[PDB]
Amino acid sequence: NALKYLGQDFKTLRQQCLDSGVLFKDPEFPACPSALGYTQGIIWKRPTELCPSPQFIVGGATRTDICQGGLGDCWLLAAIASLTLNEELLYRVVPRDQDFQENYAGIFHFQFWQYGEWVEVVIDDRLPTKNGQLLFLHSEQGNEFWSALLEKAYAKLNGCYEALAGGSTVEGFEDFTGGISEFYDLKKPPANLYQIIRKALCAGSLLGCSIDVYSAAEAEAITSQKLVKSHAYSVTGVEEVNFQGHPEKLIRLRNPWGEEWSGAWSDDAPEWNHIDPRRKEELDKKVEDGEFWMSLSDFVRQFSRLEICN
Amino acid sequence: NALKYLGQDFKTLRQQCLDSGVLFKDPEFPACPSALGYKDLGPGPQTQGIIWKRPTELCPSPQFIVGGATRTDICQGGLGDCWLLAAIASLTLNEELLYRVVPRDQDFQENYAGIFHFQFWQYGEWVEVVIDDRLPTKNGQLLFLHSEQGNEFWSALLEKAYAKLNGCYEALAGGSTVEGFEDFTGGSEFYDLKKPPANLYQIIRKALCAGSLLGCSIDVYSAAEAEAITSQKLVKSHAYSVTGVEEVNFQGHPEKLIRLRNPWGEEWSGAWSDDAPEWNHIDPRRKEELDKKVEDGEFWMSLSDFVRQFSRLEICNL
Ligand SMILES: [Ca+2]
Ligand SMILES: [Ca+2]
Ligand SMILES: [Ca+2]
Ligand SMILES: [Ca+2]
Ligand SMILES: [Ca+2]
C-alpha cells in the first residue's frame, strides 16, 4: 500500500474539487517559477485549455509518446521509454483509469519508487507552455498528455523541472523496485554482451547507454554519424540477421528526442539490401522517430556504457 | 584504477601549472554563476555578493586537513545538500573508505598549484574528479560547506568536486542521493520506524561497526514545513547522520541509546540530550565517555524517542 507524498490523497482531493465545481490547484507544487526551477513568456496551461478533447492515452502508452522538450532530462525520459516495454510495471507507475472526461477535476496521480517502497504523487494538470505549445515532454500525438503529466509528477518529487536535468537518475527512480543497477564498460565488454542484453529486454529490465565526453562544451554535441554525446539513449531491442555468410548481431536504440544514427544498419542504410528481404521488412522501419538499428560492433565503438536496471 | 572525469589528469595538469607558475583554473567548471545553480542559487538573493576565493586568499596559512578528516569538519552552509553532508559525516567513521574518496597527499605548501582531486562512485566504478580551489564566499566567509576549524579546507573542496560532478552546487540540494554517491561501492536499505523490527538496535550496531553509512529523517505533510524546527529542537525534512549506538544501565535496566549528528554542526533538547539529567543517573565513567557537552550538532537520544520522533532510517551497506 503506497505512501501518500505530503499526505495528499488523489481520490479525496478529486472529490472535493468535483463537489466544489473547481479544478485542482496543487498547493504543494504551484504553477510558479519555483516549479520550473528558473524562458520568457512561459504560461501554465491545462490540456483542456490547449485542446478541445484532450486524451490521457491514445493508442496505448508507448515510447512513441516520449519526446524531450527544452529540458536536459534525457536519462529520465530514456528510462520512461524503456519502462513502456514492461507494460505491467508501466501501468503501476502510470494508473490507467485517468482521463479528461470522467471525474475530471484537473488532478492526476502517479506511483514512483523512493526509500524502498512505492510513493504516490498527486499533481494538477497545468503544464508549462510557450507559444501555445508544451515546453517540455510531449507525445508525437499532440492530443495525448500522459507523458507530459508523468514528467511533471517526477519534477514535483524532485523539487522542480530543472532538477530533472543532468543526472543519471532522479527521485522516484533510484534503485527502482529495489533492483540492481549494473554498468558495462563497452570498451572492455563481456563476450556474451548480446545474450545479456537479450535476457534483460525479455525480463522487462530497463536498458540505456551514453557516449562520454572530455569537455563540458562537447555535451549534447552531435557526431558526424548523428549520435548525440553525453545524452541518454534507450536500448529497445536486439536481433540477429545473416549478412555476408555469417550471423550479424544488431541492437536497437531510441533517442529520447524522438528524432538518428546515419551509419551501418541505419533506416535508409544499404546493408538491409544484403539480407533476407523478409528480415528487412520486419526490422528496417523507415521513420524519423529517434529509433534505429546499429550493429553490436558499431554500438561498442560509438558508446561508452551500457546500463541495465534489473 | 579510477576513470578520469572528462579525461582530466590531476598529476599532469598540476605540473603544467607549476611549470607555468600559474594557479589552475578548471576550464570544465568555471568559477561562474553556472557553477552555483538555477533557482535558490541562480542569477539574482542568496547569490548577491558572491566572491570566489581560494583558501590561500581567505587565510595566510590554509591547511587541507587539521587533526583528522572527521565529522566535526562537516558544517552545512546556505545550501540544502543535507543528505550529502550526512553521508560524508557518516563516511568519516569508515577511515579506509574516507581516504579513498579524500586523497591524503594534497596540501597548500609543497606542489601547491590551486588544483585538487577526489574519487567518487559513478556507474559501478571509481571516478576521479579534478577541481581548482576557488570557493564561493560571501561577507568574507565560505557560503557552503565549512569546517569548525576555519583554517581547514578538505571538506569545502570535497563538496565543490561533488558540485562539479552534479553540474552545480544547487544540484546537490533536495535529494536522497547525488552523482558520485548513487549505490556507493555497489551498496541501500530503508526501515519504517513506526513499524520497526524487534532487532533494530542490533541491525544499527552491526552496520555501524561494518563502516556502513546510516542516516535518518522526519517526513512532512506540507512543503512549507520542510526545515521547520520542533519544540525539542529537531529539524523536519532534514538528513541526519547516525554515528553511534550504546547500551547503558538506567533505572535498574539496560537502556538502548542512539547517537545522531545534524549536518548543520548545530540539537535534540529532550531526554539524554547534552545537558539532560538522565546522565547523572548512569555510571559516572559511561557519562564522562558518552555525554560530551558541545554545541556541535551531535547528541544522544533513547532508541525509544528516536523511533517516536523520526520516520525512517537508511542503511547503506558497503
Ligand atoms: Ca500513445
Ligand atoms: Ca537523421
Ligand atoms: Ca527510425
Ligand atoms: Ca579536521
Ligand atoms: Ca552536542
Chain A residues near residue B317 by CB distance under 8 angstroms: none
Tell whether B95 lies on the interface with A, counting CB pairs under 8 A: no
A266 and A285 Cβ atoms separated by less than 8 Å: no
Q: How far, in Å, CA of A64 to CA of A138, rounded?
A: 10
Residue B148 corresponds to which cell in the numbers above? Answer: 569548525
Please count the other Cβ atoms lying within 10 Å of the Cβ belonging to residue A20: 10
Measuring CA to CA, which residue among A150, A148, A152, A128 is closest to residue A140? A148
For B19-47, give one letter per residue: b (16+ CB within 10 A) or e: eeeebbebebbebeeebbbbbbbbeeebb
Per-residue CA distances from B198 to B27, B194, B209, B313 (Å): 53, 12, 19, 14
B-chain residue closest to A6, CA distance:
B221
Contact B221 A6 (CB under 8 A): yes
- The number of angstroms, rounded, from the C-alpha of A31 to the middle of its chain's C-alpha atoms is 23
Q: How far, in Å, CA of B28 to CA of A240, rounded?
A: 41
The domains located in chain B, with CATH, are 1-186 (no CATH), 187-318 (3.90.70.10)
User: Phi-psi region for residue A215, left (φ > 0), alpha (ψ -120 to 50) or beta?
Assistant: beta
SS in 3 state form for B120-186? EEECCEEEEEEEECCEEEECCEECCCECCCCCECHHHHHHHHHHHHCCCCHHHCCCCCCCECCCHHH
Per-residue CA distances from A29 to A114, A197, B49, B158 (Å): 18, 39, 30, 32
- State the resolution, in angstroms: 2.2
Please count the other Cβ atoms lying within 10 Å of the Cβ belonging to residue A87: 12
Q: How far is A51 from chain B (nearest CA, A)?
A: 31
User: Which listed ligand is nearest to B266 at the C-alpha?
Assistant: 5
First vs last C-alpha separation in chain A: 22
> How many CB pairs lie under 8 A apart between chains A and B?
76
B234 and B299 Cβ atoms separated by less than 8 Å: no
Tell whether A30 lies on the interface with B, counting CB pairs under 8 A: no
Which backbone phi and psi does B166 adopt, to 5 degrees? -90, 5
Q: How far, in Å, CA of B201 to CA of B199, rounded?
A: 6
Q: How far, in Å, CA of A77 to CA of A70, rounded?
A: 12
Edge-to-edge order in the sheet of strand A305-309: A181-185, A305-309, A206-210, A233-243, A246-254, A291-295
Residue A49 corresponds to which cell in the numbers above? Answer: 485549455
Residue found under cell 518529487: A157
Q: How far is B275 from chain A (nearest CA, A)?
A: 34
B65 and B95 Cβ atoms separated by less than 8 Å: no
A299 and A191 Cβ atoms separated by less than 8 Å: no
Measuring CA to CA, which residue among B231, B255, B253 is closest to residue B245? B255
User: Which listed ligand is nearest to A258 at the C-alpha?
Assistant: 3
Chain B residues near residue A181 by CB distance under 8 angstroms: 124, 182-183
Which backbone phi and psi does A114 adopt, to 5 degrees? -150, 135
Residue A154 corresponds to which cell in the numbers above? Answer: 517526477
Q: How far, in Å, CA of B151 to CA of A234, rounded?
A: 48
Residue found under cell 558497503: B318
Please tell me which residue in A138, A158, A255, A309 is annotated as part of the active site.
A255
What does the DSSP 8-state code read for residue A248?
E
Q: How far, in Å, CA of B119 to CA of B158, rounded?
A: 9
- DSSP 3-state of A221: coil
Per-residue CA distances from B270 to B259, B261, B267, B306 (Å): 13, 15, 9, 11
Q: How far, in Å, CA of B159 to CA of B180, rounded?
A: 11
Per-residue CA distances from A109 to A4, A123, B193, B267 (Å): 10, 6, 26, 37
B251-B257-B261 Cα angle (round to 5): 145
Q: HSE, CB side, 13 Å, CA atoms: give it for residue B81.
A: 34
Q: Where are the alpha helices (DSSP H) in chain B?
A: 10-20, 33-36, 55-58, 82-91, 95-101, 154-165, 200-210, 284-290, 303-309
Q: How far, in Å, CA of A211 to CA of A217, rounded?
A: 14
B73 and B133 Cβ atoms separated by less than 8 Å: no
A169 and A109 Cβ atoms separated by less than 8 Å: no
A108 and A126 Cβ atoms separated by less than 8 Å: no
Breaks (C-N over 2.5 A) in chain A follow: 38, 259
Tell whether B68 lies on the interface with A, counting CB pairs under 8 A: no
A100 and A56 Cβ atoms separated by less than 8 Å: yes
Contact A168 B182 (CB under 8 A): yes
B108 and B56 Cβ atoms separated by less than 8 Å: yes
Per-residue CA distances from A238 to A77, A194, A263, A300, B207 (Å): 20, 8, 17, 14, 42
Compute the radius of gyration of chain B from its Cα atoms: 20
Mutual angle of helices B82-91 and B154-165, in 10-degree steps: 130
